[PDB]
């Protein structure tokens, strides 16, 4: 979700 959501899962 607006990329957001990808970086925090990344992290």
């Known amino acids: ?3 957001g ?3 925090s ?3």
């Open 1 to 3: 979700h607006a990329e």
């Open 9 to 11: 899962d990344f992290f």
């Open 5 to 7: 959501t990808f970086t």
